[PDB]
Design a protein around this ligand. Structure first.
Ligand SMILES: Cc1cn([C@H]2C[C@H](O)[C@@H](COP(=O)(O)O)O2)c(=O)[nH]c1=O
Ligand SMILES: Cc1cn([C@H]2C[C@H](O)[C@@H](COP(=O)(O)O)O2)c(=O)[nH]c1=O
Lengths: 204, 204
């Protein structure tokens, strides 16, 4: 049927990016790799400066909105690809959007507020969250990272309790690259061999 | 007490900018004038390209979120100004954001979706909508302006029916510059004479 939207989520330095690349290479020639934030766009370059230069000042709400816009500027391309039968592997998406922003404890920016901008976006057919039991970018400090992880856990916990079965949390503690690759492949293979009709999609 | 947040909304070319300028000129030396979109910022600049050039492609949802972000990157300064006693005259704000986007009739982009990103933003102490019974920028097409008009009315009617008494629709059809100014002042002046507690603020 139509291609699958596979998302791999997780904290900065958990092997997420390495695993997306591996999966991507494995699903060739019919697979695309998408990273968020997509820094090559005009909006993305703004997010880059924000991430890499602590001096670039931008309120939490604003940067948050830029991250959402960055997905919205690409979602049409994503859908077109899936419909044309192409699998897509995403390195970060809505869940990072909500978790990293909500972890800051800024007045008004709760899970609910953080999610709204992304409401309407395609939801992945499969989301894997890599969990482990630098300092180059803004959000890279041990204390914030611990904060984002509890937030990710809290958010994914709600979605799962709310009946979302497409979310699988994967513990990568003391697991090497190819061991993680095998666990992932275990969850991923079954969905790739599931037929999804072209008019069938889920949205946030 | 604190300064007042006075907002002038309306369609393109309905006298809005002239009145804002007039009011700002008369509230001196204690008044700031703020325009949205505020095109001087990095985000403001992307908005400017979108508005002045068709080549610039950006999904309706993405441009919408930038508009919102543009307000959020400036809102902390607006609050600082008001707390410091200065009055603020605004030329467009949250109401334009919702109406112009919701007027597109894009799927999932209804009044509610369009409002979410702005939730939390300080609501003005007084919002005047200049109503009437070019083509150099993107939304300046008679047929689109017509849709935006109807959307603006449905939007303001809802906020009014909810009990927001700070919204005033001023009909300026065939009225001159000095007449509109007098009508605006009749509504504005009572509000400027009202003492507002440093801590009291309303929000979207
Ligand atoms: C996709 C996305 C990323 N992030 C953060 C996660 C990272 O700390 C930062 C850079 O991510 P990266 O290392 O995957 O490029 O972006 C958000 O805060 N919001 C989002 O919506
Ligand atoms: C502030 C704002 C304006 N607009 C549109 C209305 C105007 O047609 C366009 C440019 O405004 P301007 O002529 O007042 O500078 O911006 C939105 O679409 N949403 C917003 O958030």
């Amino acid at each position: 049927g139509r291609g699958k939207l596979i998302l791999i989520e997780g904290l900065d330095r958990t092997g997420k990016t390495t695993q997306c690349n591996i999966l991507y290479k494995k699903l060739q020639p019919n697979c695309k790799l998408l990273k968020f934030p997509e820094r090559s766009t005009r909006i993305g370059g703004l997010i880059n400066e924000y991430l890499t230069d602590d001096s670039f000042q931008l309120s939490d709400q604003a940067i948050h909105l830029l991250f959402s816009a960055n997905r919205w500027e690409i979602v049409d391309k994503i859908k077109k690809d899936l419909l044309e039968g192409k699998n897509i592997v995403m390195d970060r998406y809505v869940y990072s959007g909500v978790a990293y922003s909500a972890a800051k404890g800024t007045n008004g920016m709760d899970l609910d507020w953080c999610l709204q901008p992304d409401v309407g976006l395609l939801k992945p057919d499969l989301t894997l969250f890599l969990s482990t039991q630098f300092g180059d970018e803004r959000y890279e400090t041990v204390k914030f990272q611990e904060k984002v992880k509890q937030t990710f856990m809290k958010l994914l916990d709600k979605e799962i309790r709310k009946g979302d079965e497409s979310i699988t949390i994967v513990d990568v503690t003391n697991k090497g690259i190819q061991e993680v690759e095998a666990l992932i492949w275990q969850i991923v293979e079954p969905v790739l061999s599931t037929h999804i009709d072209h008019d069938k999609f889920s949205f946030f």
